[PDB]
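Record format v2
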Amino acid sequence: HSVKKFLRVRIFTKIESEDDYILSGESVMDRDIRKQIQLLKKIIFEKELMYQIKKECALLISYGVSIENENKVIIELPNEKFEIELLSLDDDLPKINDKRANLMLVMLRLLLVVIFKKTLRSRISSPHGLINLNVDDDILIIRPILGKVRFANYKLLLKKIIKDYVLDIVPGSSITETEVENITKLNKEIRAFDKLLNIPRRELKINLPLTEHKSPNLSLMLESPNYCNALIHIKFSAGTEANAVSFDTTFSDFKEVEDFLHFIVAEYIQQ
Amino acid sequence: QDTEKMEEQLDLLSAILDP
Amino acid sequence: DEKQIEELLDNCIETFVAEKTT
């Protein structure tokens, strides 16, 4: 009992009193010579998982990720919070977020496995020698998972902004989002998780009514290059070859996208 | 073998998705 | 293998964000 610890993740939900959270979900923890090896391997593995996560979280201190206890990290989101804790079986029926806590848990482990695949590949192919790794670069565990959520939030606000500044102003308009040596056995295994590790991006195309002289076209693309922040790309062209304009823009701040959307709709889209 | 670990988790994951 | 994984993660990520919300 000295140190035999596994990790579970619990999810907290914020409520309408708005002051504090409460617990809406929790991941389960399941209970010869090879069997003692098995338990010892699953033990070291999870201790590694918490170690690396703790290291990655150093980068995320600005993004709502707090490292509180040496065995616990808390990830704060507007309507939810996540706790990832490495704990023994002495301390501490189903519910809403149990399923999600279990998924985040399996995903966490899987992310470490991919890290293992990468180090090994890094060793197989290039070095004739030893690995080289960066926390910022190849250690991604929290970022890919958390990023999926933060992006969804970001995409929500963006659509709100678009409704206000554009959809409500110009009557016919609407919006449509669109999807943007032989080690090969290894690359195929890692490629399979590109789904989880790809930097998130969606393109929001704004449909505008066709003026009979010219057809204006506007679209925005949202992306999270470092997984936790947002970039907004706006392209506008309403060509009349006498009046023809083209804008290609990039913004890190929703405040400026409102100002630029306003500018655009004002001059070019409005009657 | 880490490919063994991965198969464990995927098994675990598909099982959660389809109990 | 690969497709199985890509389909399984597609579900996992979807269910985990709960983005559907409609």
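Chain A touches chain B through 13 residues (CB under 8 Å).
The CA atoms of residues 68 and 74 of chain A lie 7 Å apart.
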